[PDB]
Amino acid sequence: RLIYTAGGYFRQSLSYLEAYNPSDGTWLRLADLQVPRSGLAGCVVGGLLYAVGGRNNSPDGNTDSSALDCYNPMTNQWSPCAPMSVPRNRIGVGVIDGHIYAVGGSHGCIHHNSVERYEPERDEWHLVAPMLTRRIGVGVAVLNRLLYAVGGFDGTNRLNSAECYYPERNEWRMITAMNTIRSGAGVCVLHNCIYAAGGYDGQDQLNSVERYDVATATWTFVAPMKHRRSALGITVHQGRIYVLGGYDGHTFLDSVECYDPDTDTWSEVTRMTSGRSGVGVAVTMEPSR
Numbered sequence: 001r002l003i004y005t006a007g008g009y010f011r012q013s014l015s016y017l018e019a020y021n022p023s024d025g026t027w028l029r030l031a032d033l034q035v036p037r038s039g040l041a042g043c044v045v046g047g048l049l050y051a052v053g054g055r056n057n058s059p060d061g062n063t064d065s066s067a068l069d070c071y072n073p074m075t076n077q078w079s080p081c082a083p084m085s086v087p088r089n090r091i092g093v094g095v096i097d098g099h100i101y102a103v104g105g106s107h108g109c110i111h112h113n114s115v116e117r118y119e120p121e122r123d124e125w126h127l128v129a130p131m132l133t134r135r136i137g138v139g140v141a142v143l144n145r146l147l148y149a150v151g152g153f154d155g156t157n158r159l160n161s162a163e164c165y166y167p168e169r170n171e172w173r174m175i176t177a178m179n180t181i182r183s184g185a186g187v188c189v190l191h192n193c194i195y196a197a198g199g200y201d202g203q204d205q206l207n208s209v210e211r212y213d214v215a216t217a218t219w220t221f222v223a224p225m226k227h228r229r230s231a232l233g234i235t236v237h238q239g240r241i242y243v244l245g246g247y248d249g250h251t252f253l254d255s256v257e258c259y260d261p262d263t264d265t266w267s268e269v270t271r272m273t274s275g276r277s278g279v280g281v282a283v284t285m286e287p288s289r
Helices: none
Strands: 002-006 017-020 027-029 041-045 048-052 055-058 061-064 068-072 077-080 092-096 099-103 115-119 124-128 139-143 146-150 162-166 171-174 186-190 193-197 209-213 218-222 233-237 240-244 255-260 265-271 280-284
Touching (some): 002 041, 002 048, 002 233, 041 099, 048 099, 048 280, 099 146, 146 193, 186 233, 193 240
Parallel strands (some): 041 280, 092 139, 139 186
Antiparallel strands (some): 002 280, 017 027, 048 068, 068 077, 115 124, 139 146, 146 162, 186 193, 193 209, 209 218, 233 240
């Protein structure tokens, strides 16, 4: 399995699909996205890589995207899917029971609290209960089949609040807030907790990382990343966390850092072919040759 990064931003939105092999260290260049996009999210259902939402910042235009597109590593081909009800720049997504939940994001000046669910078997989106909070640059994770929305930006204030969606009650409940306000953080589930790494608090890009334990309903501060970064990509591969790129207030990073929970240590493992922020990252089988 490889770590796929799709899209991103590097003075304009990007169409790159590249896949990192943590063993041999190579970056594989794969089929371009049909549309350049930054601020998208990535996920895997079945063995298929999905690119959800984002925005196309181009020298000739600036359009938020409702698109959902599907990459097959067996064919090295992208295929469009039915789009979401609304464009969602700086979206968060999570997967529950083979369904994709799209959370928050922006469309122009609209800051979404809405949430919708995609069923791959039927190629259909349906709206579900909206969040308690409008959140763009929201981090999303799934733990024990519950959907967590963490941090973000509501259009006026950046957030440390987190809330939890119960699919079969179709309702959101606030949980314990993070220690640090974070928009554009990387949020994932590792082992048995929710990690929130980096982001932006309205004054600084962050290198702090904290993790939520559901048993104690508590956020705890852990070893920080080496580089502060907002709009980073994040994923879990073979029991370790990988953070990709982002923005540090001056440059679009190509640094990839790796967190080992056994040692509570971060280390730089590779550099992307080119620095970029706002990527969609997910892990799936390596392509056919």
